[PDB]
Amino acid sequence: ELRVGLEESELWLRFKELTNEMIVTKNGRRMFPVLKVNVSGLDPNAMYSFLLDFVAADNHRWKYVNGEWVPGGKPEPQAPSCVYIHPDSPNFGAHWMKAPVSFSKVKLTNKLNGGGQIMLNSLHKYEPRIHIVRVGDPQRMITSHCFPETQFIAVTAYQNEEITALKIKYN
Ligand code: NA
C-alpha cells in the first residue's frame, strides 16, 4: 500500500510543542525544519511528480500575547493557491522510494515577487500537504497526504524566544 511517512517527526514535534513559526520575507525564506518524507508502495516503474502546498488551518488569525498564542482576529482573505513542484519531478517510483524526498529549496514569502515562492499570510497557521501526481495518466490520479506534526504559524519575525533558540540549536 502507498505509505508516506514524515522524517524527523520527533524534531518537528519539539517545534510543534512550542507552536512552530516560519519566517516569511519579501524575497522568500527556506523552512527549518525541512519537510522530508519516506515513500513506499509506489509503482517503481511508473513516473510521478511530487507537489507541495500549504493548507490554511483556521477561520481566524493568531497573536502572541503574554507568551501564549491566542486567537488574534478575523483572517485575511486566503493566500493565492501556490503549489511547489519538487525539482526531481517527474521521476520514477524507484527514485522517490530509494531515499527520503526533501523539500529543502521551497521558500515562504509574504510578497508575490516570483521565483516559485509560496505566499502565506503572516499570523495565520498552515499545514503542509504533499501531492503525488501520476505522469501520463488519462485519469489524472493524484494522492494527497497532510502532515499534522508540521503545522506552523507564518511570521515576519519570531514571536516566541523558545522558537528562536530551538531554530539555532537544531539548525
Ligand atoms: Na508570483
Swiss-Prot record:
Effect ascribed to mutating G116C: In NTD; uncertain significance
Chief site of localization: nucleus
Subcellular location: Nucleus
MF terms (GO), sorted A to Z: DNA-binding transcription factor activity; DNA-binding transcription factor activity, RNA polymerase II-specific; RNA polymerase II cis-regulatory region sequence-specific DNA binding; RNA polymerase II-specific DNA-binding transcription factor binding; sequence-specific double-stranded DNA binding; transcription corepressor activity
Keywords from the named record: Activator, Developmental protein, Disease variant, DNA-binding, Nucleus, Transcription, Transcription regulation
Record-level GO cellular component terms: chromatin; nucleoplasm; nucleus
Tissue specificity comment: Detected in testis, but not in other, normal tissues. Detected in lung tumors (at protein level).
DNA-binding region: 11-171
Top-level lineage group: Eukaryota
GO biological process: anterior/posterior axis specification, embryo; cardiac muscle cell myoblast differentiation; cell fate specification; heart morphogenesis; mesoderm development; mesoderm formation; negative regulation of transcription by RNA polymerase II; positive regulation of transcription by RNA polymerase II
Disease note: Neural tube defects: Congenital malformations of the central nervous system and adjacent structures related to defective neural tube closure during the first trimester of pregnancy. Failure of neural tube closure can occur at any level of the embryonic axis. Common NTD forms include anencephaly, myelomeningocele and spina bifida, which result from the failure of fusion in the cranial and spinal region of the neural tube. NTDs have a multifactorial etiology encompassing both genetic and environmental components.
Function: Involved in the transcriptional regulation of genes required for mesoderm formation and differentiation. Binds to a palindromic T site 5'-TTCACACCTAGGTGTGAA-3' DNA sequence and activates gene transcription when bound to such a site.
Binding partners and assembly: Monomer.
Name this protein carries in UniProt: T-box transcription factor T
Source species: Homo sapiens
Gene: TBXT
Covered residues, full protein: 41 to 211 of 435
